[PDB]
Amino acid sequence: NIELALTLVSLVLVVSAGPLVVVLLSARGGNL
Amino acid sequence: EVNIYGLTATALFIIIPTSFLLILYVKTAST
Amino acid sequence: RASTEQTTKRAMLGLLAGAVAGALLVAPAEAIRIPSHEFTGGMVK
Amino acid sequence: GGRDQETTGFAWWSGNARLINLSGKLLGAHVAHAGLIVFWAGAMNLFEVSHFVPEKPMYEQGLILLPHIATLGYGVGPGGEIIDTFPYFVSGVLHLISSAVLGFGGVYHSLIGPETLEESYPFFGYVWKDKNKMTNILGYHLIMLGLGAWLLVWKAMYFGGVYDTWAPGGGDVRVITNPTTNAAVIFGYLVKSPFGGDGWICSVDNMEDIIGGHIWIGTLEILGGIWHIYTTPWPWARRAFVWSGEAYLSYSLGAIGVMGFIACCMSWFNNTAYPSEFYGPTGPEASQSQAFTFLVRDQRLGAGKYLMRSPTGEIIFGGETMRFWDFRGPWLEPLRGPNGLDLNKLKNDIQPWQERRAAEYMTHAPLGSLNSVGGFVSPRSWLACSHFCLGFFFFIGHLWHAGRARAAAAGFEKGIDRFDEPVLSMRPLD
Amino acid sequence: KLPEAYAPFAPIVDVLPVIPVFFILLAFVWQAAVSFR
Amino acid sequence: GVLGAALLCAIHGATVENTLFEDGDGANTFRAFNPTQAEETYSMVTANRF
Amino acid sequence: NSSLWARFCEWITSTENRLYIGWFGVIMIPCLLTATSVFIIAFIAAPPVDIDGIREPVSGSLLYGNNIITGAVIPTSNAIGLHFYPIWEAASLDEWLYNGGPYQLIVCHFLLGVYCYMGREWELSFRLGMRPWIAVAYSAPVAAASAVFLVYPIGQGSFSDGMPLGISGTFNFMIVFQAEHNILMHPFHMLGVAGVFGGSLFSAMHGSLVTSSLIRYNIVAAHGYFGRLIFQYASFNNSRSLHFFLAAWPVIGIWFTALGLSTMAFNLNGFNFNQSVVDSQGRVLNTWADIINRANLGMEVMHERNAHN
Amino acid sequence: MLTLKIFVYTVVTFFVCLFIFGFLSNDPARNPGKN
Amino acid sequence: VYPIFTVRWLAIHGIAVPTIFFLGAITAMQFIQR
Amino acid sequence: PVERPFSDILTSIRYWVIHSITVPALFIAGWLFVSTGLAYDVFGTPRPNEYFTEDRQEAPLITDRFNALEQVKKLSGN
Amino acid sequence: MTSILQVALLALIFVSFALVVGVPVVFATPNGWTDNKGAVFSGLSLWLLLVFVVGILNSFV
Amino acid sequence: MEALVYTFLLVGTLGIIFFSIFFRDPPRMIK
Ligand code: CLA
Ligand code: CLA
Ligand code: CLA
Ligand code: CLA
Ligand code: CLA
Ligand SMILES: CC1=C(/C=C/C(C)=C/C=C/C(C)=C/C=C/C=C(C)/C=C/C=C(C)/C=C/C2=C(C)CCCC2(C)C)C(C)(C)CCC1
Ligand SMILES: CC1=C(/C=C/C(C)=C/C=C/C(C)=C/C=C/C=C(C)/C=C/C=C(C)/C=C/C2=C(C)CCCC2(C)C)C(C)(C)CCC1
Ligand SMILES: CC1=C(/C=C/C(C)=C/C=C/C(C)=C/C=C/C=C(C)/C=C/C=C(C)/C=C/C2=C(C)CCCC2(C)C)C(C)(C)CCC1
Ligand SMILES: CC1=C(/C=C/C(C)=C/C=C/C(C)=C/C=C/C=C(C)/C=C/C=C(C)/C=C/C2=C(C)CCCC2(C)C)C(C)(C)CCC1
Ligand SMILES: [Fe+2]
């Protein structure tokens, strides 16, 4: 069932791609 | 003249409360 | 016949459930309670 | 960074309202939103291509974007048969790449670009109260829209043509050599009644009319853009409207909501710009096809059958489907005479493809379910429902924003003064 | 079913359509990162 | 009774929120109020006339 | 200033009239007056109307053996469909009555009147210094009426599917509509029911607390009662946020139920859980959804005539 | 009935023109605020 | 501030413990071939 | 005497230590309660292969009040 | 030559992911846009060139 | 006879509505 696992991995990576920017800005004292 | 008792009930239900309310309003309006 | 076919997903889901439940139960209760302290803290009855 | 409630007066849930007087941030937001729109377009096109079985018809597998590309005549042959699915893939990929570009532009303008563009970029800077710069923007975008319409006409006339569903022996891709530019025909639709039998704008039934209407729209839009760039509103115009950002937003909301309702009706009823063999049959088409199939089967078996007279006196299919007696379709016109269906042609002028198409449409009526179980939801149903809901909400938005804009212009968008209540300055016992 | 050359990239495509629905959510997160100021 | 109750709820909310007294500089009218107010936060006269 | 047109404008827009007119008023008043006149006249002395178009007229007027509960104005004949059917387009007045034109007249004039009523609400709010968002609140009942009277017939394809202007007509419309679309299981009708019930709840409870608080404090004294009665301390501490919530709950509920009715007009459906539970060997185990389906099937079989002479 | 159609058309046109020219007669300037 | 096992503790736990138990039960139910 | 705030417990270490080890126990308890089939026995819910008995091929019917226990025991197949 | 196109496309996916995670971070970081203009422009140029080469490779597949 | 009764009741309701609208006691209590 490689297809389902790869789909879940891609979904998790894409989901994490968003809050990662906010976390980086907060930790680095950005102007968010 | 169909359902004479029904007509009487409707007429009484429309008259007695209406007369009571109008009498009360006239009595209080004199004040 | 009825029987669960998944073996180890139970623990993985339980850890997440507990970790989320702790925070999700403490936070709203805090938010609702602080005003309760404020109201019952000098002007009550 | 972002503003605060105390500085701006708008809470977080009204946050975007803080962009009314920031030209650069507003431009960045709009560019980002356009990039997001094209992102969804490309992503959905790729998603539907990856789940597309060319053997089966489009309307049997819940596709709503592929039909739009097919109607223009990309990878489609006679009878709505798919030849290749490369055009759809290239369309999706190009949309996604353009989405990347637009998203980068929007993010840049929203985070780094100047907050106000009227200090160092006078051409792009504007103030809502200005009645010349805003008209200039209106003219530029009218020119853009007219150019797009003329691009559609150019495709329909010189780049392979479009998919005409009224061509003999089923639809096919053909080139409209002589679009009808007659003013009476083109503008007759606009003044046509919106009721049954008339079909205000949804009754357009031939591609020539569509291409001619687009010619007229492109010409008029380019002319209007040129006129607006070189003109200022008349005094009556300056006294009739409210000149502020929210007023323009309200006007746009009203227009776009009306457009959404019109799209709902066009998708539900029309089958010329929405050919049946891509979007599936309309409800009237499904009922008429069921009646036609039953009549054909009864005549073939030998055991007319159901054909009544319309209130006007024509000949129509009988039963519960007599309501749908205004339906016209490619698979039924050859069987229609001067006054309704003709008995002779209905008897011995039925070709196999018409019967096959009627049988196919019979079992795929718009009957469906939100659970998507079956009488299966036709794409027409999804489009109509979604766009009716969007049009209603955008009409509500027009109400809200128009009211707020007028109140703010008057000067009481925050409440009654409490020192000079207008009501207290009026005769009592209204 | 996508050209064969891009066949292995099928699953990722199945996630693209839902991404826009995330952007709105991101906004809230960003606001939650500034204490809803 | 039930439909009239819904009508009363909606009408009362709309009328109270659309006859508010301007006692706040900001464009948001929710912060222009505290529980210890003396006078009511909406104009009964204006709503009655409307 | 003294021009006749200026005086007419001043009178129309004057706030000293007993009932404000405004321009929305000058549009609506003839419309609603025509609608109500025709409605009264047809409700009292209209002849039977061929709703189904199978030469089986349905009586709905008081003179033709009816009472207030069972009276109604029958929708237009199914033969007409969506065709515009004014008086001047019918062959004769008797045929116009037979097919059901007064329903179309009343519904069109009534819809225009309610839209202009929504407009003049805003107009008076603007002429009085009030904020303009009462029309938004009124848009919910207007949206629901628009759905029931115009959008359902549009999707279905005939004005015979619109709600009859009557009581038993309304109940018949509901029963048929449940039979055909299964409204009860649609999430939007669930939201509408929630909106109505919650609006009743909030009206009753707001009235209770305000009446209790009002003595010979309106929000600081009663909040002590509600904060501990059902917990939710500092839930609605503002007299403004609370009233906005009151305005928002039922309005959104009714917007959603109207949208659900329109979608059912374009016929997606409510939920459908028929035969959703099966044991081993494939046998079907009934749920309450199956009993609801049996009731719907009975309703549908009664609604359809099929055999029409 | 041509007469009825003409009468109804005349009435509707009169009312619609009255309405349109009413909202064109400087409506936004007649409000109780001063701005 | 120090004492535990208060009325609030009991009120929270009486509705928290069965909730977790039932969530586990329903999650297990999900994975039944039937 | 003041019913400590929730913020204090949120930052506490003993609370997290207890809960991170006790809540998964409850979750696994429920999972095993459903998986091992104890739920069917305890609550009398028939298994998907026990709805229809060999002798009975239709929904059961109690049709008896004061002997309902024996009736249910017979109908359930036990 | 499907393998070359597939590996180039995967490299494009990774480059675009890095660019997406970085560009807003660079922009929002104070005094960061002017400090890292060169890196951002180089990344954008690489992204465009990789898109174009992927397209050409597809044209040859 | 029933039709006359129904019409009379409806006309009475309409008349009460009209009187309440136009012949109401003036609201000087708060205004
Ligand atoms: C609605 C869209 C829009 C608008 C109004 C602007 C406006 C602006 N941008 Mg932004 N930008 C956009 C989209 C937009 N941009 C997008 C999508 C991107 C990503 C690629 C960028 C990336 C970007 C950067 C990186 C920078 C700007 C800058 C600027 C400013 C200077 C314009 C300039 O460089 O002169 C160029 C002017 C031209 C006329 C050349 C444009 C070339 C186009 C492609 C040809 C067509 C233009 C022509 C006039 C139209 C012909 C019509 C014809 C067919 C009839 C200006 C305020 C600069 C600035 O100062 O920051 C604020 C800057 O550094 N923009
Ligand atoms: C699509 C909808 C949309 C758009 C385009 C915008 C756009 C904007 N908003 Mg609005 N906003 C929205 C929805 C939207 N908002 C919603 C739904 C809410 C309520 C939750 C708000 C609440 C809100 C407030 C309260 C404020 C704004 C502000 C702003 C501006 C500053 C950007 C920002 O967040 O600060 C900077 C934020 C960051 C730097 C953190 C986000 C980092 C990145 C951009 C996340 C996304 C990265 C993306 C995935 C990368 C794309 C790749 C590409 C580069 C290749 C900007 C013009 C502010 C402003 O300027 O007002 C004056 C402001 O005060 N907004
Ligand atoms: C030179 C003036 C000018 C021009 C040309 C444009 C052009 C454009 N603006 Mg506008 N804009 C301007 C000034 C201008 N702007 C100013 C001064 C401001 C204030 C700062 C703005 C603010 C603004 C905002 C806020 C937005 C735009 C947007 C847009 C784009 C939207 C196109 C679209 O989808 O609509 C309809 C058009 C189409 C769907 C496409 C039509 C077909 C294209 C144009 C044909 C391409 C060429 C053709 C193939 C070849 C023709 C050959 C022929 C010459 C012989 C468009 C490119 C929007 C956008 O999304 O930008 C990215 C947007 O949201 N602009
Ligand atoms: C995006 C489209 C758009 C927009 C927003 C505007 C906006 C504007 N235009 Mg421009 N215009 C456009 C396209 C556009 N125009 C095009 C394409 C053309 C070429 C035909 C023109 C030609 C044009 C001229 C020649 C003039 C304007 C003027 C105006 C201004 C006044 C509004 C108006 O026209 O009266 C709104 C409408 C009325 C006041 C009266 C309408 C009353 C009728 C009875 C309503 C019913 C319409 C119709 C008959 C019903 C049947 C159709 C129906 C089925 C839909 C306003 C700034 C005027 C201005 O201020 O000068 C710059 C002006 O003199 N425009
Ligand atoms: C392009 C169209 C457009 C634009 C540019 C704006 C722009 C604006 N609006 Mg308007 N509005 C619009 C359409 C538009 N609106 C429509 C169609 C409606 C009808 C619902 C409204 C109703 C509306 C109200 C009632 C208010 C605004 C406000 C605002 C301002 C702040 C944005 C906001 O609400 O915070 C960001 C928004 C949110 C955090 C809300 C996100 C959650 C939404 C409600 C649900 C998410 C969508 C959902 C999944 C879909 C459900 C429906 C589905 C069946 C289709 C801003 C000036 C506010 C303001 O301050 O006015 C000055 C305000 O009070 N607008
Ligand atoms: C500001 C902000 C915001 C928003 C923003 C936005 C909305 C943005 C957008 C953006 C965008 C909109 C972007 C885009 C991008 C794109 C890209 C980057 C693309 C890429 C592509 C790719 C990578 C591809 C791939 C492929 C293909 C080609 C197909 C198939 C195969 C594959 C998959 C390989 C918010 C409000 C939230 C909040 C605040 C902040
Ligand atoms: C494509 C098409 C076509 C054609 C088309 C066309 C030709 C169009 C046109 C169109 C047009 C041409 C449109 C127009 C519109 C307009 C409008 C929509 C307007 C509106 C207005 C208003 C709303 C106003 C208002 C007001 C008021 C009432 C207040 C006071 C002031 C004023 C007056 C401003 C054809 C059929 C061939 C084909 C198919 C489709
Ligand atoms: C396609 C793709 C890409 C890109 C992508 C992107 C860029 C995406 C983005 C995405 C995003 C950007 C996402 C976001 C997400 C977010 C989320 C998912 C959120 C969530 C949230 C939540 C869930 C919340 C909740 C809450 C709050 C609001 C706070 C308070 C509490 C509560 C809990 C209520 C590339 C080209 C690289 C490559 C290929 C793949
Ligand atoms: C994969 C593919 C391919 C290729 C591809 C390519 C090559 C792509 C490219 C793409 C691209 C390359 C894209 C681009 C885009 C861009 C855009 C989208 C832009 C926009 C811009 C704008 C919008 C601007 C504006 C403005 C300015 C700048 C200034 C003035 C004002 C205005 C506003 C006008 C092939 C065929 C091999 C195969 C199939 C598919
Ligand atoms: Fe109240």
What do you see in this structure?
This is part of a larger assembly, with 12 protein chains of 12 kinds. With 31 residues, chain B is an all-alpha fold. Helix content of chain B is 84%, strand content 0%. Helix content of chain D is 52%, strand content 3%. Chain D has a two-stranded antiparallel sheet with strand order 1-2. In chain D, strands 3-4 form a two-stranded antiparallel ribbon. The two termini of chain D are 52 Å apart. Chain G has one domain. Helix content of chain G is 60%, strand content 0%. Chain G contains 10 helices and no strands. Chain G is flat. Chain J has 78 residues and is an all-alpha fold. Chain J has one domain: Single alpha-helices involved in coiled-coils or other helix-helix interfaces (Up-down Bundle), CATH 1.20.5. At the D-G interface, helix 9 and helix 14 of D face helix 4, helix 5 and helix 9 of G. Bound molecules: chlorophyll A (5 copies), beta-carotene (4 copies) and fe (ii) ion. Residues 27, 31, 101-102, 104-105, 108-109, 113-114, 117, 121, 124 of chain D line the site of one chlorophyll A (CLA). It is classed as photosynthesis. Keywords: monomeric Photosystem II, PSII repair, photosynthesis. Cryo-EM structure of an intermediate-state complex during the process of photosystem II repair. Chain A is Photosystem II reaction center protein Ycf12. Organism of A: Chlamydomonas reinhardtii. Chain B is Photosystem II reaction center protein M.
Discrete helix count of chain E: 2
The share of residues in helices of chain E is 40-55%
Biggest sheet architecture of chain E: none
Radius of gyration of chain I: 15 Å
Global geometry of chain E: rod-shaped
N- and C-termini, Cα separation of chain E: 48 Å
Could you tell me which chain pair has the largest interface and how many residues each side has?
D-G, 52 and 50 residues
Structural class of chain I, by secondary structure, is mainly alpha
* Class per helix and strand makeup of chain E: mainly alpha
Reported for the largest beta sheet of chain I, the result is: none
Shape of chain I: rod-shaped
Helical proportion of chain I? over 70%
What ligands does this structure carry? chlorophyll A, beta-carotene, fe (ii) ion
User: How many beta strands in the DSSP annotation of chain E?
Assistant: 0
Approximate strand percentage of chain I: under 5%
N-to-C terminal Cα separation of chain I, in Å? 51 Å
- The fraction of residues in strands of chain E falls at under 5%
Rg on CA atoms of chain E, Å? 16 Å
Q: Give the strand tally of chain I.
A: 0
PDB class: photosynthesis
Keywords: monomeric Photosystem II, PSII repair, photosynthesis
Entry title: Cryo-EM structure of an intermediate-state complex during the process of photosystem II repair
Chain A: Photosystem II reaction center protein Ycf12
Note the topology.
This is part of a larger assembly, with 12 protein chains of 12 kinds.
Chain B: H1 4-29
Chain D: H1 5-8, H2 23-50, H3 66-71, H4 86-111, H5 133-158, E1 162-164, E2 172-174, H6 183-188, H7 207-229, H8 235-240, H9 245-269, H10 276-279, H11 283-301, E3 307-309, E4 315-317, H12 343-348, H13 352-362, H14 379-410
Antiparallel strand pairs in D: 1-2, 3-4
Chain J: H1 6-11, H2 13-35, H3 38-43, H4 68-75
